[PDB]
Amino acid sequence: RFLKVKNWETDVVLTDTLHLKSTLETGCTEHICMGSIMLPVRTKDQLFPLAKEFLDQYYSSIKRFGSKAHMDRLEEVNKEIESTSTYQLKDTELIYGAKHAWRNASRCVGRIQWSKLQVFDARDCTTAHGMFNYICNHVKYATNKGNLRSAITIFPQRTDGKHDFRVWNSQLIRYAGYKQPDGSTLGDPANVQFTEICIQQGWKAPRGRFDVLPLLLQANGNDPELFQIPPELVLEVPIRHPKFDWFKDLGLKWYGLPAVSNMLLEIGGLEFSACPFSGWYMGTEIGVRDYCDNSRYNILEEVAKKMDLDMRKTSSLWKDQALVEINIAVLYSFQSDKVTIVDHHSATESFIKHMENEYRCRGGCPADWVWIVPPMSGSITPVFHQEMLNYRLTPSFEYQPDPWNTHVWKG
Amino acid sequence: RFLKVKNWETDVVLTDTLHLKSTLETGCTEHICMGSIMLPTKDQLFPLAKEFLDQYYSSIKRFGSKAHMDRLEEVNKEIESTSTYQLKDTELIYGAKHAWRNASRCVGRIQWSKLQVFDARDCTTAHGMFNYICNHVKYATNKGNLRSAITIFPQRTDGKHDFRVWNSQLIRYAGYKQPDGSTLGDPANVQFTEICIQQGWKAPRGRFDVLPLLLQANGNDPELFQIPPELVLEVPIRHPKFDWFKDLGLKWYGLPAVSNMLLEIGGLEFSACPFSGWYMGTEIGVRDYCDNSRYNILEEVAKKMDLDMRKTSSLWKDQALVEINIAVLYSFQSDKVTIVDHHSATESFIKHMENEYRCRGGCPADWVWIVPPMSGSITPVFHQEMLNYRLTPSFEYQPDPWNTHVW
Numbered sequence: 001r002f003l004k005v006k007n008w009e010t011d012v013v014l015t016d017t018l019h020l021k022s023t024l025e026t027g028c029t030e031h032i033c034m035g036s037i038m039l040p041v042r043t044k045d046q047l048f049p050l051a052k053e054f055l056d057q058y059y060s061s062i063k064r065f066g067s068k069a070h071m072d073r074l075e076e077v078n079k080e081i082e083s084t085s086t087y088q089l090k091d092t093e094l095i096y097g098a099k100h101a102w103r104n105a106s107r108c109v110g111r112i113q114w115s116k117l118q119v120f121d122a123r124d125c126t127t128a129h130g131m132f133n134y135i136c137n138h139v140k141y142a143t144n145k146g147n148l149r150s151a152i153t154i155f156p157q158r159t160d161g162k163h164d165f166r167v168w169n170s171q172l173i174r175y176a177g178y179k180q181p182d183g184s185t186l187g188d189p190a191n192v193q194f195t196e197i198c199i200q201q202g203w204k205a206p207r208g209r210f211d212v213l214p215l216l217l218q219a220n221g222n223d224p225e226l227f228q229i230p231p232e233l234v235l236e237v238p239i240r241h242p243k244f245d246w247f248k249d250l251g252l253k254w255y256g257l258p259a260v261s262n263m264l265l266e267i268g269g270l271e272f273s274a275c276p277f278s279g280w281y282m283g284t285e286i287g288v289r290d291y292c293d294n295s296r297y298n299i300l301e302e303v304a305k306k307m308d309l310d311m312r313k314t315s316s317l318w319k320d321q322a323l324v325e326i327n328i329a330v331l332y333s334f335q336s337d338k339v340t341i342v343d344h345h346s347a348t349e350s351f352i353k354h355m356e357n358e359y360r361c362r363g364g365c366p367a368d369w370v371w372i373v374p375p376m377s378g379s380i381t382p383v384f385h386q387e388m389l390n391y392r393l394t395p396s397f398e399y400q401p402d403p404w405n406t407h408v409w410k411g
Numbered sequence: 412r413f414l415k416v417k418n419w420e421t422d423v424v425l426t427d428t429l430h431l432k433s434t435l436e437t438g439c440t441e442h443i444c445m446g447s448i449m450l451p452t453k454d455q456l457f458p459l460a461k462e463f464l465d466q467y468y469s470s471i472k473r474f475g476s477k478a479h480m481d482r483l484e485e486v487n488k489e490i491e492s493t494s495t496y497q498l499k500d501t502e503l504i505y506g507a508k509h510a511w512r513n514a515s516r517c518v519g520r521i522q523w524s525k526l527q528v529f530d531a532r533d534c535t536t537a538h539g540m541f542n543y544i545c546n547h548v549k550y551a552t553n554k555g556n557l558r559s560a561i562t563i564f565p566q567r568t569d570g571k572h573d574f575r576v577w578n579s580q581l582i583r584y585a586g587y588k589q590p591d592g593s594t595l596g597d598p599a600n601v602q603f604t605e606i607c608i609q610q611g612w613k614a615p616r617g618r619f620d621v622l623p624l625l626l627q628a629n630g631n632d633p634e635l636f637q638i639p640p641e642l643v644l645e646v647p648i649r650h651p652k653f654d655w656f657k658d659l660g661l662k663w664y665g666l667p668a669v670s671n672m673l674l675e676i677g678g679l680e681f682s683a684c685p686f687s688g689w690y691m692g693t694e695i696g697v698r699d700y701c702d703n704s705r706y707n708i709l710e711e712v713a714k715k716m717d718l719d720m721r722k723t724s725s726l727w728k729d730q731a732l733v734e735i736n737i738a739v740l741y742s743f744q745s746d747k748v749t750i751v752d753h754h755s756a757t758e759s760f761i762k763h764m765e766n767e768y769r770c771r772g773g774c775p776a777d778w779v780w781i782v783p784p785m786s787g788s789i790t791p792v793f794h795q796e797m798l799n800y801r802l803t804p805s806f807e808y809q810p811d812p813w814n815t816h817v818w
């Protein structure tokens with residue numbers, strides 16, 4: 001079967017055949033679409049099919065499908081599974097796997113970059129201190145003094161589900177949040193619960209508006225341990241505005257390195273529960289979401305006050321007006337400091353070119369519209385007008401429960 | 412089978428039970444989500460009739476009463492005897508209000524129960540359709556104090572005698588391809604404008620010419636009518652700060668009025684059912700004015716503001732966008748023509764969802780359509796999980812008549 005997507009701005013029609021390789025389910029049915037829902041220990045029996053699919057894909061990509069090397073590798077994995085109940089990926093398979101998980105990430109607008117990913121194999125890691133060292137090297141490498149490089153670090157896979165490696169931080173670099181007795185929050189309200197855990201674990205909190213959180217690292221199912229990332233390794237950008245000189249006095253800054261650390265990488269049926277990955281920011285992630293969500297830094301009011309906008313009626317579009325100025329400031333600040341960042345116009349345009357390329361060469365590009373369209377100025381970006389098909393390919397990045405809900409404390 | 416929706420801003424969780432009565436299909440499967448696709452006889456009719464009359468009699472607290480049973484029998488008799496049936500006025504009013512209540516792509520549904528229904532089922536000619544439409548236009552406009560309305564022409568019979576308004580909206584501006592090469596007026600209406608011209612319309616060939624209505628009665632060939640200009644309320648667009656804004660020479664009409672959809676009530680199909688309310692500002696300022704394939708005025712406005720257009724990252728598009736949208740709202744407000752901004756409209760819709768969850772057990776919503784085309788995440792609907800499903804009565808899309816009609 002063939003499925004068609006139209007672009008309503010250009011009349012370009014694309015044909016998707018790749019959806020036919022989709023195994024995992026969406027959450028939708030013929031009766032309900034769950035396309036805006038945020039979140040919609042294996043047997044030998046289930047594992048060999050999953051290994052086999054993956055290795056067929058791997059061997060096709062290198063143009064070795066059906067070769068003796070392909071067949072030997074199948075038999076070798078077959079045997080390893082029946083005997084040890086799991087298997088180990090070759091380095092080449094791990095790299096390929098990690099790239100394809102990003103390639104297949106339908107909520108990611110940055111996928112034009114998927115083939116340039118530095119993969120750090122941390123499968124020889126055994127302790128939290130070992131994880132810290134690996135994560136430091138990743139941060140240093142990825143930061144590269146502001147000239148950001150995409151990377152992922154991959155810690156040992158799940159075995160019995162009792163020995164999981166986890167990074168408890170949701171991102172490697174984030175700011176603490178502190179709930180005050182008066183109900184207000186200092187710092188980032190998204191991070192209050194995790195900040196509370198860090199404190200209970202013995203972190204001494206500076207208690208400011210931009211305190212970089214310590215890493216909380218679990219190796220081998222053991223209790224997590226605290227580590228402070230060396231501050232010289234944490235690149236930060238002070239936010240100022242090109243025409244508004246009062247903007248710097250808001251006291252705003254952000255970190256340069258977006259690095260997601262709470263997801264699970266599935267490759268060939270294996271589950272990598274700690275696989276922090278990083279790229280570079282699209283401006284709106286900071287300027288729209290981090291700064292202007294009501295449940296985050298929520299600075300729209302204070303900015304609009306300072307701009308002397310008419311604030312008595314929403315219909316002045318004061319919020320929209322302040323929103324644009326903050327986003328200009330974020331992009332200006334990163335650019336002035338020579339820290340890589342991409343605006344939403346440039347990122348969405350590139351994504352459209354990527355998606356079209358993917359249709360021609362791969363027969364599809366799964367994409368989640370709800371996530372791909374930027375959170376400001378949606379319809380003046382070319383993706384708004386682009387029909388998309390969302391479906392699940394493996395290898396993949398998946399969500400997993402927060403570890404403080406599942407972890408068996410050892411004491 | 413009982414489903415949760417969460418708001419990620421407020422942590423409020425709602426439980427949806429209403430989806431279990433969804434009848435029509437979505438386009439999605441367990442394997443593939445089609446959430447972002449624009450367009451994804453005797454025997455069939457009685458189930459549909461029963462389903463509808465059952466909900467109707469439940470709504471007036473008379474489910475299972477003799478008056479309920481007697482109507483079901485009467486309708487059964489009529490279908491068996493005549494191959495179709497006729498709705499009572501009360502059923503028609505209820506069906507129309509509910510097609511709107513069920514419209515998952517409509518952010519304005521807090522208003523659903525205040526809908527003026529004009530019963531045009533006695534209409535027989537295109538001139539009759541024109542009279543009914545002028546009256547609708549004048550009632551809804553109400554000197555700028557807009558009132559929601561729908562006018563319902565006769566239902567489909569054998570499908571060879573369809574009533575249709577050929578216009579996509581009652582009030583739209585013409586579009587002409589130029590010797591230049593570009594496009595004068597609204598590029599969306601170029602083809603419809605050609606059909607008008609080929610059927611006799613004398614076009615003034617300007618940027619903002621109100622198109623004529625093209626009306627089809629009883630499956631006959633459509634006929635042209637100009638709407639009395641005095642009934643088409645229009646707004647010149649100016650900015651509260653930028654004096655030069657007026658010089659672009661922009662105007663828009665006050666009455667949004669969709670006229671190409673099909674109303675389905677209890678299995679009956681009303682192929683001509685123009686309806687109208689009032690605008691959310693972004694529909695005009697973001698979509699009509701700024702879509703590349705529309706009036707596409709971003710480039711010209713940015714220039715008048717003297718912004719740096721060398722690089723996308725100065726956000727000159729975003730800056731100009733907000734101003735265009737401030738101007739729309741300001742101009743409608745100054746001329747006392749009802750309009751709603753996207754902040755107010757999305758806030759009301761969140762309130763409406765909560766009402767519908769509390770009183771009905773759900774509210775079908777299409778997030779892709781409900782979230783405004785500018786400033787998405789600073790409106791509360793961005794953070795609201797929504798379940799999309801199809802309930803009946805409904806407004807449905809239908810093919811453009813020029814592709815179906817034989818002359």
Ligand code: HEM
Pocket residue numbers: 102105107108109110111113117150151152260263277278279280281282285342347371397
């Ligand atoms: C190269 C620069 C990149 C840019 C500009 C970019 C852009 C983005 C943005 C804007 C989001 C949405 C985040 C949100 O709204 O919460 C996202 C999501 C995501 N991206 Fe990227 N991306 C980049 C690199 C990467 C890399 C290197 C990977 C993995 C190797 C990746 C995988 C993902 C995944 C799995 C998500 C979904 C996250 C979630 O569901 O919470 N991206 N991307």
Ligand code: HEM
Pocket residue numbers: 511514516517518519520522526559560561669686687688689690691694751756780806
């Ligand atoms: C009272 C003020 C109203 C407001 C502010 C409003 C708001 C909107 C908006 C912004 C859209 C999306 C339009 C687009 O982006 O193309 C829409 C769509 C829609 N509305 Fe409303 N609405 C109103 C009244 C009505 C009424 C009176 C009806 C029917 C009786 C209705 C039924 C629909 C339907 C069926 C759609 C989807 C149109 C399509 O699929 O192309 N709405 N509404």
Ligand SMILES: COc1ccccc1CNCCO[C@@H]1CNC[C@@H]1Cc1cc(C)cc(N)n1
Pocket residue numbers: 038039110258259260277278279280281282285
């Ligand atoms: C309450 O939050 C949630 C809950 C469930 C699922 C997803 C989320 C939100 N997404 C979490 C990850 O997204 C963060 C937001 N900004 C940076 C990061 C995404 C990202 C990753 C990378 C590698 C690059 C980039 N530019 N952006």
Ligand SMILES: COc1ccccc1CNCCO[C@@H]1CNC[C@@H]1Cc1cc(C)cc(N)n1
Pocket residue numbers: 449667668669686687688689690691694
């Ligand atoms: C190119 O456009 C399309 C093509 C196919 C399907 C749907 C669409 C989009 N809908 C077309 C009709 O919608 C128009 C857009 N602005 C006004 C009207 C929607 C509307 C209706 C009503 C009753 C009120 C309101 N405020 N807005």
Ligand SMILES: C[C@H](O)[C@H](O)[C@H]1CNc2nc(N)[nH]c(=O)c2N1
Pocket residue numbers: 035036037038370371372419793794795796797
């Ligand atoms: C409920 C809704 O799905 C949710 O708010 C989504 C919408 N789109 C998004 N898009 C991105 N890129 N990131 C997000 O966190 C969200 N949140």
Ligand SMILES: C[C@H](O)[C@H](O)[C@H]1CNc2nc(N)[nH]c(=O)c2N1
Pocket residue numbers: 008384385386387388446447448449779780781
């Ligand atoms: C392809 C995509 O579905 C299309 O551009 C949609 C997106 N959301 C929309 N939302 C509204 N309200 N109106 C529209 O016309 C569209 N267009």
Ligand SMILES: [Zn+2]
Pocket residue numbers: 028032033034035439443444445446
């Ligand atoms: Zn779906």
